[PDB]
């Protein structure tokens, strides 16, 4: 009765549907293990242990490619056109960004259909193409600048219009993308944070692509413009009492979420730039953090090795799984076009992904409605 | 439509229209026959039908208080 | 039939005290005269003591 | 690239929302036609005697409204900095923040972010008028309003339940539980915490470990509570006078443990407590300074040294540095900690005032007559304290 009373999605019938979607995605027929190279190596040593955690996992904005970089060695790039995850590895590159250092961060290109930008830890950003016919990965260029000490992070603009590479001690670089990959500006981190010797932990682009959010070690949060080439500081608020771990954005452009090393996770709205909702998560330090693409599920994963699932409008809990016997740093990641997710860690350092037959939550409620309606058209 | 219909009928207080936006005139009112039906009908909430139509009826009576159709203290004194 | 008068709102703020701190105990510690002239008249001369 | 498609519905709920594809709005759009949004600062001060006095201590149920008024205050002091109308602008914001902003902060449950926005307005105040507001809200708690009194009795009941099950194995996650209760309202929750420090041992090492998750508001209240327990009326010296007390030693290990571990903490009002109280001649001010030199500095005494070790200390050498490594005289290890402490004594301009005070207090002990053997020890104890204070001056003030 309570299904067919409301014919549009209300606040209450949405929170009861999304608690059945997360309940039915943990099942037996709705989970499959990714046939990786480490899933081959672990399954031999377990039938008959060296840890290499993953360092990044990124999705293409079309939602059709997935790349990720293990600790010791290689990049791995999967290609999914529609077949769930059993379609094709295209490439994996054992010496990807050189043969001396590691691959720390990754970013895809939103404009070009097939191009990554892998950043080492030395001083150099190597842009490389992933070939579609053959299984190879050829380079395109290699960027560098003067007074460049050690780059850690790289981010593309969500419009594909800039590139932001940052050190955690010295400086922050902008590279224009449209004309040529040329340095436009450079800002010293001591001008951003005036207090002490801070270490930049996380960064994010806004949904428009004109502001940058920077999270320090002392708990400060700086918001700084990028108009055409100028890079100046707009505000500076003190958010947490600890290092700001991760920063996310709402996909509807309403609010943004920050996490820290105390058990603390706020939801700040983007108009008035004040805190709006507080999640009471007094368990441990939040490690990873992500939202859905409809903007309703929020996945928190702390250092108690337990994952939670909240709402963004309210702050209520939907589901909770405990994964305690593993030795992972487990990574949640939601798909960008459909409402599936890929939770890392099955045995040692692995990746499973949790599927259904319906893509969204909206085409799940629309199928639950039409199955109930047949019964009321039966009586 | 509902407001512009009541302002042309002969049940609108033409000279007793006095407003609730002042501080001395929450007793000077208009149309005490409609104040006798509104406060009688906001007092009945015991059946299972008028527990569901209560939010729509109460929202309509607050548009009639903005405009000056009913006095404020004639509803506040005589409702349960 | 009761003539409602206009209400009177208080636009005045509360005034402070003569104790410049919270307690009378914490305030008493901050009234001791400190300086280099106070030690001067106490230790005055050792040969006068000797 | 295609945009997202939504569709409006008009509902009866006042607050705007957005579901998976549907957004909801209030049906009566002319709800704000009689109201007028007011002008800059002179109209806010008139219209707040009407609206904000109806919900007195209930503004803390809307924490986003308490954060908005506090940013009007910081942005008004800074733009009207000038040099002429600044002592007038601060005084106008003293009486506003104490009539109906600080009572609203006490009815808060878990908001360390709503309390940091209020304190950034109180950083512009003198510390005398900031200590007036703290004491009065522990006096008009009980004699005045009821909803504030139910809130203070809920924080004290919760702080007294954490401190009982406080063990050295549970502080992995009870450090984060305890530090949000302090960060929200410290005046209710810190006072049962320092009252359980001077009662039992082994709880100084647990509370100082929790202090890495405090905010800047709970660092300024903790200095007020420690100044409250030291001037509190109690027998400082024990009955006959052979010993001091049991609380006066447990509280000086706590103070000397905040100046070593926590670096975002100003203790420059404990130091000027020591200056004015040594002029009187005191036994609480001495036993704090004795633990500040032995713990923060690493200076140890030459009372149990061997004859082979004594010649190594005088040879100006790295043989000198190895001899301190054997008698646990860690000076060069913590040079960053000990140089921060010495700067507190220079801003008071009181390094040559401590030396002349510790000297005549050693000679004033040849005038008092209370006991016999303890006055032979107190003459020797004010000799090790003066010797070990000079050794901290020579190590830091070079040039």
UniProtKB/Swiss-Prot annotation, chain A:
It comes from Saccharomyces cerevisiae (strain ATCC 204508 / S288c) (Baker's yeast). This is Protein TEX1. Belongs to the THOC3 family. InterPro entries: Tex1/THOC3, WD40/YVTN_repeat-like_dom_sf, WD40_repeat_dom_sf, WD40_rpt. GO terms for molecular function: mRNA binding. One of its GO terms (cellular component) is THO complex part of transcription export complex. SUPFAM superfamilies: WD40 repeat-like. GO terms for biological process: mRNA export from nucleus; transcription elongation by RNA polymerase II. Pfam families: WD40.
Swiss-Prot record, chain B:
The chain holds residues 241 to 320 of 1597 of the full protein. This is THO complex subunit 2. It is found in: Nucleus. Present with 521 molecules/cell in log phase SD medium. Component the THO subcomplex of the TREX complex, which operates in coupling transcription elongation to mRNA export. The THO complex is recruited to transcribed genes and moves along the gene with the elongating polymerase during transcription. THO is important for stabilizing nascent RNA in the RNA polymerase II elongation complex by preventing formation of DNA:RNA hybrids behind the elongating polymerase. Component of the THO complex, which is composed of HPR1, MFT1, THO2 and THP2. Together with SUB2, TEX1 and YRA1, THO forms the transcription/export (TREX) complex. THO associates with DNA and RNA in vitro. Belongs to the THOC2 family.
Curated annotation (Swiss-Prot), chain C:
It comes from the Eukaryota. Signal peptide: none annotated. Disulfide bonds: none annotated. It is found in: Nucleus. Component the THO subcomplex of the TREX complex, which operates in coupling transcription elongation to mRNA export. The THO complex is recruited to transcribed genes and moves along the gene with the elongating polymerase during transcription. THO is important for stabilizing nascent RNA in the RNA polymerase II elongation complex by preventing formation of DNA:RNA hybrids behind the elongating polymerase. HPR1 is not required for sporulation, and is not essential for DNA repair. It is probably not a DNA topoisomerase. Component of the THO complex, which is composed of HPR1, MFT1, THO2 and THP2. Together with SUB2, TEX1 and YRA1, THO forms the transcription/export (TREX) complex. THO associates with DNA and RNA in vitro. This is THO complex subunit HPR1. It comes from Saccharomyces cerevisiae (strain ATCC 204508 / S288c). The gene is HPR1.
